[PDB]
Amino acid sequence: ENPMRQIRIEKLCINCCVGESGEKLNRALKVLEQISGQKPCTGKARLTIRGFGIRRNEKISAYVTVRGEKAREILNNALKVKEYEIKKSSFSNTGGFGFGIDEHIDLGIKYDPSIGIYGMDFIVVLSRPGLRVSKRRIKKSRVGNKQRISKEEAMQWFVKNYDGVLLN
Amino acid sequence: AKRKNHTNHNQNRKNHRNGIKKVKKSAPSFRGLNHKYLRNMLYSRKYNNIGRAAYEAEHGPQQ
Amino acid sequence: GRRPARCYRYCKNKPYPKSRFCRGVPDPKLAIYDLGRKRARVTEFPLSVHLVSNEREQLSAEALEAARIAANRYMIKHAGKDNFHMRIRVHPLHVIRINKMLQTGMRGSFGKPYGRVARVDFGQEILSIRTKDAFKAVACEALRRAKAKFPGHQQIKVSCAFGFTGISREEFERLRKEGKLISQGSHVTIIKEKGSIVGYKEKLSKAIQ
Amino acid sequence: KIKKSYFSRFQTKLRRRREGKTDYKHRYNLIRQDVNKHGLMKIRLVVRITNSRIICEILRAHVDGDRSIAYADSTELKRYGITFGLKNYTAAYATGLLVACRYNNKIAGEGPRPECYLDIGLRRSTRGARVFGAMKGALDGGLVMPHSLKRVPGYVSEEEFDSEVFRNKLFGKILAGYMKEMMENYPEKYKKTFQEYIKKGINPDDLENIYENAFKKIREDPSRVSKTHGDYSIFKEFKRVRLSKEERAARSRAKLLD
Amino acid sequence: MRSNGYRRGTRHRFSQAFRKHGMPKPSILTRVFKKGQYVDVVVNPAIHKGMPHKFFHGRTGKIFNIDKRSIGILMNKRCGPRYVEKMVIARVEHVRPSRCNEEYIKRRTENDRLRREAAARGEKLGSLKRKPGGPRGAVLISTENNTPIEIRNEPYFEVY
RNA sequence: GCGUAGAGCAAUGGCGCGGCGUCCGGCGCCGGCGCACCCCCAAACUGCGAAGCGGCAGGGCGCGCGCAGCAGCGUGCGC
RNA sequence: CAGCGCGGACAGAACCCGCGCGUCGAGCACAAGGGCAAACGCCCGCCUCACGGCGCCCCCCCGGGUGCCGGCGGGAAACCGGG
RNA sequence: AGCUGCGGUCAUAUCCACAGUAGAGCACCAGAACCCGUCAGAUCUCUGAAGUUAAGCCUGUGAGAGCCUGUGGAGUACUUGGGUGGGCGACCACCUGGGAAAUGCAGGUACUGUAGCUU
Ligand SMILES: [Mg+2]
Ligand SMILES: [Mg+2]
Ligand SMILES: [Mg+2]
Ligand SMILES: [Mg+2]
Ligand SMILES: [Mg+2]
Ligand SMILES: [Mg+2]
Ligand SMILES: [Mg+2]
Ligand SMILES: [Mg+2]
Ligand SMILES: [Mg+2]
Ligand SMILES: [Mg+2]
Ligand SMILES: [Mg+2]
Ligand SMILES: [Mg+2]
């Protein structure tokens, strides 16, 4: 069929909400430097929550976005942790899916005890070519329903592209 | 002591005894005009039938 | 301790509801606006009788409760607790004030919230009972026990409408046979040719008959 | 879900804003004239870049709509030898050069000339943007616009503008050097990315002379070549026709029956 | 007793119409204005600068002065037994070119043209007054294909 | 130009019951919540909006020539 | 933007991130009203028009509007700025 | 006839759903040495033309939601003016003019300026 409807990885977003500032965060954004190869972004806490110990505007999390084929090697390494097996409900309504690994050294990273151990959320965004019509500056419009990815078309893509196994 | 605060009673009747007089007609005034426009209009009136180049040929530099 | 209702009879003031500007008004003693078998379907009580105000005045919330109890006790004792559904139409939304004045007199005269009244017009229904046709005379009698609690003149009217829908009994019967009615409990929706046709066929699916 | 009161109370934006085509705050400040001038609506050089071509227009606002004074397209650069890279920086410069020499050859030189103003539209005003290449092309063709050269390459100060480092951007010497080294180090990647360059026969060493020769021919003969394009009512059968009201009713009554 | 700010009591006067909010369209910038032309001040409340007083929001006045962004307008106001001429400065977003003399100008330019042309051919036209609605004309309504219909009072019935 | 009477619950803010539910809780029912219809409404609510009022116009125009430092190809002002 | 929806290790009612929707229900020091969505809100850069001298208007003032000649800031510019 | 640039009207244009579109245009799209801008060449910026009409754009469809127009509601509601009309009042009736709104119902889903391009 048509080559322009083919589903790709549009971007992969990683974040580790370590929950507090200090050296554990500054080591955690060094981990996203190791994985992505990019300089990550720090997340600020939106409110001050007594139960979690966070303050408003406190640097709480570290996040990054990786694209291209560089996002694919981060993904299949992260999918080798989860045996390429993801729950059906973990796929989003809008065509994405996500999972979270518990230690980053399952990605092919040596330990480095001065850094530590962090878990992270891998958020996969899928698209067909033609997403630019919703993201560009001039003549911005909605992408059509045929070109939007459903949850099931993301599920069909996940079993076809990665030899995936759905759950439940 | 406490008495009446306000009324407009008999005011329209008072205001129409000598009528509501119009704005009294006057000579046209330069009050409120644009200053760059008014400056230029007076320059056109100063050199009305004789041009500026002929005027400064007579009276020298007019500024 | 309550003033007589002749002091707050007529709609003298602009309507003055409980709002952010008028707070501290107590709750009305008229608590219930639907009596009898409220859950009864639209096609069970064809007859409709109304107590209609022939006055422009303010019905007290106290009189609205007293006429409620007078009419509800009669429909229970004579028609029975299942054979009617009586709805109180007017709601006591207007707040009346009392000056209550050492004795200040007329200085600072604007009054505190004193009670709640419902403001009715000429021809406005106050109460309405939906019954079977056998209990016409019962329902006419319960409303004349209600209008004793009310100031001024009221009129009991037997309406040709079917129950609490606006549709007349001849016109309601026809559309019920046509399949054009979807019940909403006390009232009804008439099925029209305006939807999408897949939605129209779901509308005939949920019709009454 | 969204309630019905949403749609009934929804006030749509202006159609060219819903289309994402005009910045009406920017458009308001751009075409604004002093009330002292009353009729003299300002001319504006509007530069628009598409995927294929670069549009340059001098046009003036009226009540019914803007009236075009002059037009040039980068597709018109084929007469001047430029058939390659129709949306690059130099095609932007040459198209800006083309309206400026069209508009000056249109009006005769007895009275003073009005100032024109640059209309980027919704493109970003960056240093090295093509929309300012069309600005710089228009000033070289004699169109008087109250510019400053801060966003054209070669700028170091308001008094000092380096024409030489402007010229290697302009004459493709930055492009040809990139085009030349790709041809040596990755000849097959050179074969794929510059396909219409090879089919045109363009060579990167030849590329400066093509642009320099084009700039003379624009300034010598900027005159518009016209195409008549007489009849296109053949294309009328390609459009579809609407149904009638009773035919819409006939499909609806049929849809009820099945 | 109400407070006397510059926009007092303008909750409805300085509002926008339903589904007609927003900044003004750029087409207002293509309107000409001339000295002597009548304009209607109607305030655009989206434009906060150059807003006239609320008193002039219904009023129509003649332009005396034209500025860079604004317009001076002569508007008379009753101060007791006199009309006092106020000079109203308003941005152009708050005015409209008035159609008060719209039909007079249409009448005048045609009639002055017809008087010029008749004077050219040696004729003259006496008076071109607007004739008002006079008496009714005589009518002939034939009962051919139009039979008279009786109107009767009908018995009062009431529906309930 | 207005936003009163009326009208309207469509947004804001209230009032009240039913109806519906691949919603939640409790033990089919009850209670929440959601939706659609509906109900009673508003001096400090308005998708509408009168009667009634307010402003302004019903006279100078057309043409031509001069002038300007304004303007950039007009606008004013003189005749 | 408020808010909603659906996804995501620890992670919970409430940490963060993503995608989708979202007529303004958010925000604009504050009272209320009006206003406002490629903004009048948010963020960032550069700034200090929160300026001098002459006027005029709305007009008791207060406050605001509008010009002219200078001096500037931002911007590629039109423009905008006299808190 | 259409597309496109710039517009005018600012929903008959919005919103949902499903269809179809030869040409050219508009696009999506290929890429990132440079200018430029980012966490990320996603956007912006530059360079390209290998692919593709899948989307956008366009058009059609829908007893679609809304919106628009007509009609109706209705001479109804309300009201200017008048009476030594009525009524204990509340207020009502009459006379003379003016005269609505919501629901309903029917049809409509765009017009247009300028410029360029398309057989
Ligand atoms: Mg007593
Ligand atoms: Mg009173
Ligand atoms: Mg801009
Ligand atoms: Mg201000
Ligand atoms: Mg009101
Ligand atoms: Mg009312
Ligand atoms: Mg708000
Ligand atoms: Mg102030
Ligand atoms: Mg100021
Ligand atoms: Mg419809
Ligand atoms: Mg009398
Ligand atoms: Mg349609």
| Strand-pair category, A85-87 with A165-167 | parallel
Beta strands in chain C (DSSP E): 34-36, 47-53, 57-60, 84-88, 94-98, 112-120, 125-131, 154-159, 181-183, 188-190
Longest dimension (CA), chain B: 80
How close D24 comes to chain E (CA, Å)?
7
Distance, in Å, from the CA atom of C66 to the CA atom of C63, rounded to the nearest integer, reads 5
C159 contacts C50 by C-beta, under 8 angstroms = yes
Vertex D23 angle, CA D21 and D27, to 5° = 115
Q: Packing angle between helix D89-106 and helix D130-140, nearest 10 degrees?
A: 40
Does the beta-carbon distance from A141 to D123 stay under 8 Å?
no
Cβ neighbour number for residue D129 with a 10 Å cutoff: 20
Residue A24 half-sphere exposure toward CB, CA atoms < 13 A = 11
Distance, in Å, from the CA atom of D94 to the CA atom of D83, rounded to the nearest integer, reads 12
D202 contacts D211 by C-beta, under 8 angstroms = no
Resolution of this model in Å is 2.9
Cβ neighbour number for residue A21 with a 10 Å cutoff: 17
CA dihedral (A128, A129, A133, A135) positive or negative: positive
The DSSP code sequence of A23-46 is HHHHHHHHHHHHHHSS--EEEEPS
Does the beta-carbon distance from E68 to D32 stay under 8 Å?
no
Vertex D63 angle, CA D144 and A140, to 5° = 80
Q: Packing angle between helix D245-257 and helix C197-205, nearest 10 degrees?
A: 40
Contacts of C201 in chain D (CB under 8 A): 256
Distance, in Å, from the CA atom of D95 to the CA atom of D218, rounded to the nearest integer, reads 9
Nearest alpha carbon to residue C126 among C73, C89, C168, C151: C89
**Sequence-ordered list of residues with C-beta below 8 angstroms from that of C36, at least 6 positions apart, any chain:** C72, C75, C81, C82, C83, C84, C85, C86, C129
C164 contacts C48 by C-beta, under 8 angstroms = yes
Nucleic acid strand H: bases within 7 A of protein CB: 1-2, 4-11, 13-19, 21-23, 25-31, 33-37, 39-40, 42-57, 59-67, 89-92, 104-110, 112-119
Tokens of D200: 């045109």
Q: What's at C140, amino acid-wise?
A: C
Distance, in Å, from the CA atom of D84 to the CA atom of D87, rounded to the nearest integer, reads 9
Mutation for C interface: D248, D252, D257, most C CBs within 10 A: D252
- The 3-state secondary structure of chain E reads CCCCCCCCCCCCCCCCCCCCCCCCCHHHHHCCCCCCCEEEECCCCCCCCCCCCHHHHCCEEEEEEECCCEEEEEEEEEECCEEEEEEEEEEHHHEEECCCCHHHHHHHHHHHHHHHHHHHCCCCCCCCCCCCCCCCCCCCCCCCCCCCCCCCCCCCCCCC
What residue has token string 């129950």? Answer: C163
Distance, in Å, from the CA atom of E94 to the CA atom of E103, rounded to the nearest integer, reads 23
B24 contacts E89 by C-beta, under 8 angstroms = no
**Sequence-ordered list of residues with C-beta below 8 angstroms from that of D27, at least 6 positions apart, any chain:** E26
Distance, in Å, from the CA atom of E72 to the CA atom of E89, rounded to the nearest integer, reads 5
Distances from the Cα of D56 to the Cαs of A28, C44, C117, D106, D109, in angstroms?
51, 76, 73, 16, 22
Distances from the Cα of C18 to the Cαs of A40, B22, C111, C121, D13, in angstroms?
55, 51, 14, 20, 39
What residue has token string 């085009």? Answer: D179
Question: Residue E51: nearest ligand to its CA?
Answer: 4
* β-strand partners of C116: C95
Q: Which residues of A128-155 are buried (b: 16+ CB within 10 A; e: fewer)?
A: beebeeeeeeeeeeebeeebebebebbb
Distance, in Å, from the CA atom of B22 to the CA atom of D239, rounded to the nearest integer, reads 66
Q: Measured in whole angstroms, how far is the alpha carbon of residue E43 from the centre of its chain? A: 15
* β-strand partners of A165: A85
E101 contacts E38 by C-beta, under 8 angstroms = yes
Distances from the Cα of D175 to the Cαs of A88, B26, D179, D181, E149, in angstroms?
50, 74, 6, 10, 92
Does the beta-carbon distance from A138 to D19 stay under 8 Å?
no
Question: Residue C14: nearest ligand to its CA?
Answer: 2
* β-strand partners of C80: none
User: Is E35 within 8 Å of chain B by CB?
Assistant: no
Q: What's at D160, amino acid-wise?
A: E
* β-strand partners of C60: C117
What residue has token string 């639907």? Answer: C34
Distance, in Å, from the CA atom of E152 to the CA atom of B4, rounded to the nearest integer, reads 58
C119 contacts C11 by C-beta, under 8 angstroms = yes
Cβ neighbour number for residue C145 with a 10 Å cutoff: 16
CA dihedral (D51, D52, D57, D61) positive or negative: negative
Q: What's at C46, amino acid-wise?
A: P
Chain C partners (3+ C-beta pairs within 8 A)? D, E
C85 contacts C38 by C-beta, under 8 angstroms = yes
* β-strand partners of C182: C189
CB-based contacts of A128-135 (< 8 A; 24+ apart in sequence): A128/A4, A128/A5, A128/A6, A128/A7, A128/A8, A129/A4, A129/A6, A129/A8, A130/A4, A131/A10
Vertex D160 angle, CA D156 and D164, to 5° = 75
Q: Which of residues 43-72 of E touch strand G (CB under 7 A)?
A: 45-51, 53, 67-70, 72
Vertex B61 angle, CA B56 and B63, to 5° = 115
In degrees and rounded to multiples of 5, residue D156 shows phi and psi of -120, -30
* β-strand partners of C134: none
Contact pairs from chain B to chain E, CB under 8 Å: 32
* β-strand partners of A16: A62
**Sequence-ordered list of residues with C-beta below 8 angstroms from that of C186, at least 6 positions apart, any chain:** C38, C42, C85, C87, C130, C163, C164, C165
Residue A142 DSSP symbol: P
Q: What's at D29, amino acid-wise?
A: N
Contacts of A140 in chain D (CB under 8 A): 20
In degrees and rounded to multiples of 5, residue D131 shows phi and psi of -65, -25
Q: Measured in whole angstroms, how far is the alpha carbon of residue C154 from the centre of its chain? A: 14
Cβ neighbour number for residue A109 with a 10 Å cutoff: 14
- The 3-state secondary structure of B8-42 reads CCCHHHHHCCCCCECCCCCCCCCCCCCHHHHHHHH
Residue E145 Ramachandran class (φ > 0 left, ψ -120 to 50 alpha, else beta): left
Residue C75 Ramachandran class (φ > 0 left, ψ -120 to 50 alpha, else beta): alpha
Residue D82 DSSP symbol: -
Distance, in Å, from the CA atom of C83 to the CA atom of A114, rounded to the nearest integer, reads 82
- Number of helices and strands in chain D (H, E): 11, 4
Cβ neighbour number for residue B54 with a 10 Å cutoff: 11
> Which H or E element spans position C197?
helix C197-205
**Sequence-ordered list of residues with C-beta below 8 angstroms from that of D218, at least 6 positions apart, any chain:** D80, D94, D97, D98, D101, D141
Distance, in Å, from the CA atom of A38 to the CA atom of A73, rounded to the nearest integer, reads 14
Cβ neighbour number for residue D19 with a 10 Å cutoff: 13
Distance, in Å, from the CA atom of C188 to the CA atom of A20, rounded to the nearest integer, reads 59
CA of D53 to the centre of ligand 10 (A): 42
Residue D114 DSSP symbol: P
| Strand-pair category, C181-183 with C154-159 | unpaired
Nearest alpha carbon to residue B40 among B49, B50, B30, B27: B30
CA dihedral (C131, C135, C140, C144) positive or negative: negative
Distance, in Å, from the CA atom of C84 to the CA atom of A39, rounded to the nearest integer, reads 75
User: Is B15 within 8 Å of chain E by CB?
Assistant: yes
Residue A96 DSSP SS3 = coil
Distance, in Å, from the CA atom of D170 to the CA atom of D90, rounded to the nearest integer, reads 6
E82 contacts E52 by C-beta, under 8 angstroms = no
Distance, in Å, from the CA atom of C85 to the CA atom of C108, rounded to the nearest integer, reads 47
Residue D214 DSSP SS3 = helix
- Number of helices and strands in chain C (H, E): 4, 10
Tokens of A13: 């977003």
What residue has token string 């021809």? Answer: C123
D211 contacts D133 by C-beta, under 8 angstroms = no
Beta strands in C54-138 (DSSP E): 57-60, 84-88, 94-98, 112-120, 125-131
Q: How many residues does chain C have?
A: 209
> Which H or E element spans position D137?
helix D130-140
**Looking at the C1' of nucleotide G80, which residue has the nearest alpha carbon?**
D29
Radius of gyration, alpha carbons of chain C: 21
What residue has token string 């007579």? Answer: B58
Q: Which of residues 177-196 of C touch strand F (CB under 7 A)?
A: 183-187, 189
Residue D198 DSSP SS3 = helix
Distance, in Å, from the CA atom of B62 to the CA atom of D110, rounded to the nearest integer, reads 29
A12 contacts A65 by C-beta, under 8 angstroms = yes
Cβ neighbour number for residue E151 with a 10 Å cutoff: 6
Q: Packing angle between helix A70-81 and helix A23-36, nearest 10 degrees?
A: 110
In degrees and rounded to multiples of 5, residue E123 shows phi and psi of -85, 180
Q: How many residues does chain A have?
A: 168
Distance, in Å, from the CA atom of D61 to the CA atom of D46, rounded to the nearest integer, reads 12
Q: Measured in whole angstroms, how far is the alpha carbon of residue C17 from the centre of its chain? A: 18
Q: Packing angle between helix D207-220 and helix D89-106, nearest 10 degrees?
A: 10
Distance, in Å, from the CA atom of E39 to the CA atom of E94, rounded to the nearest integer, reads 10
Tokens of A132: 């630019």
E47 contacts E24 by C-beta, under 8 angstroms = yes
Distance, in Å, from the CA atom of E104 to the CA atom of B5, rounded to the nearest integer, reads 48
Distance, in Å, from the CA atom of C133 to the CA atom of C147, rounded to the nearest integer, reads 22
Q: CA torsion, points D208, D209, D211, D215, in degrees to nearest 10?
A: 140
CA of C15 to the centre of ligand 6 (A): 10
C125 contacts C50 by C-beta, under 8 angstroms = yes
Cβ neighbour number for residue A41 with a 10 Å cutoff: 13
Vertex A150 angle, CA A119 and A144, to 5° = 125
Distance, in Å, from the CA atom of D92 to the CA atom of D105, rounded to the nearest integer, reads 20
Does the beta-carbon distance from B21 to E87 stay under 8 Å?
no
